[PDB]
Amino acid sequence: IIGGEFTTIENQPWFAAIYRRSVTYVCGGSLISPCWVISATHCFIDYPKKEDYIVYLGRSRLNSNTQGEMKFEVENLILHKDYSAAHHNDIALLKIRSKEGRCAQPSRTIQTIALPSMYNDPQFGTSCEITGFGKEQSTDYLYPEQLKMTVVKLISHRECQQPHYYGSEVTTKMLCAADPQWKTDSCQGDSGGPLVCSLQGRMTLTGIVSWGRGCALKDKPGVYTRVSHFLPWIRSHTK
Numbered sequence: 001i002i003g004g005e006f007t008t009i010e011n012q013p014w015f016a017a018i019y020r021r022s023v024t025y026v027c028g029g030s031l032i033s034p035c036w037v038i039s040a041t042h043c044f045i046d047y048p049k050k051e052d053y054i055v056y057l058g059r060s061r062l063n064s065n066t067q068g069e070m071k072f073e074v075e076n077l078i079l080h081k082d083y084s085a086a087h088h089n090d091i092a093l094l095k096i097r098s099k100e101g102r103c104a105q106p107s108r109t110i111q112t113i114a115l116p117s118m119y120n121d122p123q124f125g126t127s128c129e130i131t132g133f134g135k136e137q138s139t140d141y142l143y144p145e146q147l148k149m150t151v152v153k154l155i156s157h158r159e160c161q162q163p164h165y166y167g168s169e170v171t172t173k174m175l176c177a178a179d180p181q182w183k184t185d186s187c188q189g190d191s192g193g194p195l196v197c198s199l200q201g202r203m204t205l206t207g208i209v210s211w212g213r214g215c216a217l218k219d220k221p222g223v224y225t226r227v228s229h230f231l232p233w234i235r236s237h238t239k
């Protein structure tokens with residue numbers, strides 16, 4: 001995350017830290033249920049084998065072991081079959097189970113986030129949050145050690161559809177978000193992470209970090225996977 005502020009897992013008890021096996025951080029994720037973490041398909045497309053992944057919950061540090069955190073294996077790695085690298089249908093599901101075979105046990109640093117209602121997103125210009133261990137700066141080589149989160153505003157399709165923006169690269173199955181100043185945003189590493197908005201007075205998983213041109217660049221909104229357009233896929237795939 002470019003800009004924003006640091007936080008701990010307590011303010012994002014539903015965020016998951018996904019890693020892979022020869023050692024290393026892959027992408028953020030969101031716990032939508034006890035055994036299911038939702039993320040982005042572009043995050044696993046190159047290494048489809050569910051056996052090289054570790055998913056932590058209740059974790060606020062990148063290379064440290066946040067006390068209270070839980071480590072899980074990936075019982076299932078479900079990628080959207082209609083994905084295409086700008087990314088289409090950039091949504092993925094990971095069924096978690098630890099070694100002693102258990103799903104996630106809710107607590108103060110681990111909780112679930114509710115999904116939206118079909119085709120229902122906050123009004124445009126609304127403030128939402130984004131969490132991740134992504135770069136704090138485009139030129140940075142390292143990733144922040146502490147978890148980060150910032151605020152961005154929902155942009156209309158018409159607006160993001162423009163050409164000085166992303167033109168046609170963006171579809172109705174996608175959401176754009178940005179600062180009015182373009183000074184804060186999601187960036188490399190933050191993919192798969194949650195775009196949370198309060199809808200009807202309820203923290204809702206409105207989007208999943210998917211892509212964007214650069215980071216915090218003018219007229220270059222961060223694009224997210226519009227979750228309220230994927231519930232049937234999500235429901236059937238978690239049956």
Ligand SMILES: NCc1ccc(CO)cc1
Pocket residue numbers: 185186187188189190191209210211212213214215216221222223
């Ligand atoms: N390469 C990942 C990436 C994620 C997100 C944004 C949003 O700016 C940009 C880039």
